Amino acid sequence: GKLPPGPSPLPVLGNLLQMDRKGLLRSFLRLREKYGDVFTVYLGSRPVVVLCGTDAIREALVDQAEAFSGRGKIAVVDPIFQGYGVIFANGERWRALRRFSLATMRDFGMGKRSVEERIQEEARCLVEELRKSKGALLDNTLLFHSITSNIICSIVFGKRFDYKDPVFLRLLDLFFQSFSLISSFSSQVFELFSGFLKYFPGTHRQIYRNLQEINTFIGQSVEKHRATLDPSNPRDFIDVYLLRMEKDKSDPSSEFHHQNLILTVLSLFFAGTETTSTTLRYGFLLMLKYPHVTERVQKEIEQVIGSHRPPALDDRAKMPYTDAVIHEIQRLGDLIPFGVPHTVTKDTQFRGYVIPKNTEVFPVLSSALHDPRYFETPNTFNPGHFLDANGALKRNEGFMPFSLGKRICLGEGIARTELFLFFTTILQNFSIASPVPPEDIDLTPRESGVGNVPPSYQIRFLARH
Numbered sequence: 001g002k003l004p005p006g007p008s009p010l011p012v013l014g015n016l017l018q019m020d021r022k023g024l025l026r027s028f029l030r031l032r033e034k035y036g037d038v039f040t041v042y043l044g045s046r047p048v049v050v051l052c053g054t055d056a057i058r059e060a061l062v063d064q065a066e067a068f069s070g071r072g073k074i075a076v077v078d079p080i081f082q083g084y085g086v087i088f089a090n091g092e093r094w095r096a097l098r099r100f101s102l103a104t105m106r107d108f109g110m111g112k113r114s115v116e117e118r119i120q121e122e123a124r125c126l127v128e129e130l131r132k133s134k135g136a137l138l139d140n141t142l143l144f145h146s147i148t149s150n151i152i153c154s155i156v157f158g159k160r161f162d163y164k165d166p167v168f169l170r171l172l173d174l175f176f177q178s179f180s181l182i183s184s185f186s187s188q189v190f191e192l193f194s195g196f197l198k199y200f201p202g203t204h205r206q207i208y209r210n211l212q213e214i215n216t217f218i219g220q221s222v223e224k225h226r227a228t229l230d231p232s233n234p235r236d237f238i239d240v241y242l243l244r245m246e247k248d249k250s251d252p253s254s255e256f257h258h259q260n261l262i263l264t265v266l267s268l269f270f271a272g273t274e275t276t277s278t279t280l281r282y283g284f285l286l287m288l289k290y291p292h293v294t295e296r297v298q299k300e301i302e303q304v305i306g307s308h309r310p311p312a313l314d315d316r317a318k319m320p321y322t323d324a325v326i327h328e329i330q331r332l333g334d335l336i337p338f339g340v341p342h343t344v345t346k347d348t349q350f351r352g353y354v355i356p357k358n359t360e361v362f363p364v365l366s367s368a369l370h371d372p373r374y375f376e377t378p379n380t381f382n383p384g385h386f387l388d389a390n391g392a393l394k395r396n397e398g399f400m401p402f403s404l405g406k407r408i409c410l411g412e413g414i415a416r417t418e419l420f421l422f423f424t425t426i427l428q429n430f431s432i433a434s435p436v437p438p439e440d441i442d443l444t445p446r447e448s449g450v451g452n453v454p455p456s457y458q459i460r461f462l463a464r465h
């Protein structure tokens with residue numbers, strides 16, 4: 001039957017000649033226009049099936065969600081992970097690392113209460129930290145990273161850190177830079193010709209280091225727990241893991257090594273801290289660019305929540321507009337443009353084509369968030385996309401920033417919450433302004449790649465009365 005259509009690949013370099021010089025994302029979209037919604041591009045000696053548009057990403061990830069449930073390697077970070085840990089695990093190892101990781105969070109707040117009170121509590125510390133700066137010029141990057149990070153730490157590490165704790169900031173600064181580098185041009189280059197470049201110095205190297213430092217700290221805490229582990233009273237993801245580890249003294253085919261702990265924690269620590277926050281950050285840029293939206297987002301925080309209490313979770317259900325503004329931020333944000341590398345397990349008959357077992361599939365999520373089919377004016381910040389004539393939230397098929405299928409984000413729950421509770425609580429005690437006029441605001445991503453890092457802007461949170 002053969003693979004989907006796609007430019008013929010030269011030996012070794014593959015389609016290095018049909019790519020675009022702007023990046024993997026821009027390259028895929030250009031290939032889409034000539035070869036369709038489902039095409040095969042060769043990233044080196046690698047045949048990968050690209051999926052563009054809402055319908056093409058669902059017909060695979062949702063309706064044949066079993067064949068497309070495989071995970072692929074990422075050039076730069078594969079060295080660290082090597083198929084280990086919950087994010088890059090595959091097969092039985094994955095199923096059980098998800099089964100665990102997922103149900104571990106549930107034991108510590110993923111049931112959305114003891115976590116809500118944690119997020120709420122964190123916002124309280126944010127509001128106090130910001131109010132203390134008297135609303136001067138600050139880069140909200142390292143501070144937003146903190147609030148979202150402490151939420152996964154409240155679960156995976158038990159403790160939380162201080163916004164000024166030295167060891168804590170170093171951890172966060174690493175996650176910030178490690179994400180930029182991974183999303184940089186060279187990382188996308190390294191994706192194609194890793195087999196050659198991996199012998200020379202470059203960014204892919206400073207990535208290995210950066211993460212190995214967070215690994216050093218991870219193990220350093222894993223031991224700090226080990227020596228104080230009380231079985232009758234597990235404290236966090238670690239303890240429970242060390243326990244599921246103790247209940248398997250003999251089985252050498254348990255998928256719970258020291259490896260999977262050091263690497264699963266890394267995944268949750270990273271993922272949890274990182275994307276939830278850059279989304280909060282990208283968000284507040286829009287909130288400066290389209291201020292009339294900010295005012296209306298506040299008029300709702302007022303009409304529904306008031307000024308006395310904090311924003312609680314159930315409040316989101318009674319704030320249609322604000323739920324849409326968050327949704328749109330998340331849509332035009334698009335922190336993970338082409339998703340995380342998928343692969344097919346079985347030989348998959350799909351749209352007339354046959355995709356070989358273990359062939360990689362790239363779900364172009366960005367192409368679904370921007371599908372003209374499912375969005376009027378896809379190219380502009382528009383809270384209306386998610387509103388019916390009445391003014392109540394309207395589900396949109398094309399809204400998948402967390403992706404779809406048996407491989408959907410675990411942070412779906414905590415993230416969407418962190419977003420809302422953090423977005424409102426801030427806008428409830430602060431109003432934002434920047435020296436850069438709404439007209440001169442440039443949403444254009446400082447770095448566009450596997451991730452989509454927004455520029456770093458100066459902003460100030462002005463107290464309210």
Ligand code: HEM
Nearest residue numbers: 087271272275276279336339340402403407409410411415
């Ligand atoms: C705005 C916030 C977030 C966004 C947009 C996001 C997005 C994504 C995406 C696109 C994927 C992979 C999609 C795919 O497999 O096709 C993913 C997977 C994953 N996320 Fe996130 N994420 C966010 C926050 C979080 C948080 C807070 C956590 C944990 C606390 C987390 C943990 C994970 C894990 C463990 C996976 C891999 C699951 C698997 O491979 O089966 N993420 N996320």
Ligand SMILES: *C(=O)Cc1ccc(C(C)(C)C)cc1
Nearest residue numbers: 077179270271274275276451
């Ligand atoms: C949000 O999570 C940013 C992000 C996503 C995925 C990764 C990995 C997959 C660990 C490289 C890093 C940062």
